[PDB]
Structure 1
């Protein structure tokens, strides 16, 4: 449990201190309200925003950077689909993605260790669950 909690706390700090700090990133902070953007959900089948990512982190959805990056990269993919690649929204989404990748890279050593520990704790719990299943 301790490694997963630490990993989640680190991901949350990247979201609030780096990604939400990107200038003009406010349109990405919360889910789109269709009352302001009427056809958003007709175009975007897999919506994503920074609040949803923080909610996912609170629930410990991410065990590795790969699953975290899958949701982060959706923010950029959704913007290119809805706004076009040339849009100022897309430029902001790219800057949110950039600061995320750059921050994760600066934490590479410690995040690799936490990911290995999360995986080790998971595998050990599953082996124990299988052995005790006949009790």
Structure 2
């Protein structure tokens, strides 16, 4: 957490969110938790809400020690959209672009994230 490997790892994840996932066109509705004022039934239907701001807060708190836990929350954003909006909703297509560019960027950074993950895991000993 305070160690530089965790901080460097969190920094890379935050940059994927801000530079790539939040840059997806029309992605604003995913940037923050759903507003109940405009979507009144949302929290009755979706039991485990997730959004990009919540992911960034988790990164800031160093919640993620590897990409598997990060991806679990990223994929939950899409899972909720399929359930709430439907599999062919414009909003679900946006969520899929967000998820897709996240995976693509992780791949571009693989060798580097792999090293940080290994060292973070090593230090947990």
TM-score range, shorter chain: over 0.9
Deviation by residue 1:15-55 (Cα, 9 ceiling, x = unmatched): 00000000000000000111110000000000000000000
State the SS of the aligned residue for 2:20: helix
Deviation by residue 1:106-126 (Cα, 9 ceiling, x = unmatched): 00101000000000111xxxx
Q: In 2, distance between residues paired with 1:113 and 1:50?
A: 25
What is the TM-score when the length of structure 2 is the normalising length?
0.97
Give RMSD over aligned pairs. Answer: 1.7
Deviation by residue 1:60-117 (Cα, 9 ceiling, x = unmatched): 0000000000000001000000000010000000000000000000001010000000
Q: In 1, distance between residues paired with 2:89 and 2:37?
A: 21
Q: In 1, distance between residues paired with 2:109 and 2:100?
A: 14
Alignment of 1:40-59 (within 5 A): 40-59=42-61
Q: In 2, distance between residues paired with 1:95 and 1:33?
A: 21
Give the unaligned 5+ runs of structure 1: 123-134
Q: In 2, distance between residues paired with 1:35 and 1:110?
A: 42
**Total equivalences in the alignment:** 123
What is the TM-score when the length of structure 1 is the normalising length?
0.90
Q: Which has the larger radius of gyration?
A: 1
Q: In 1, distance between residues paired with 2:15 and 2:88?
A: 29
Where does residue 121 of structure 2 map in the other structure? 119
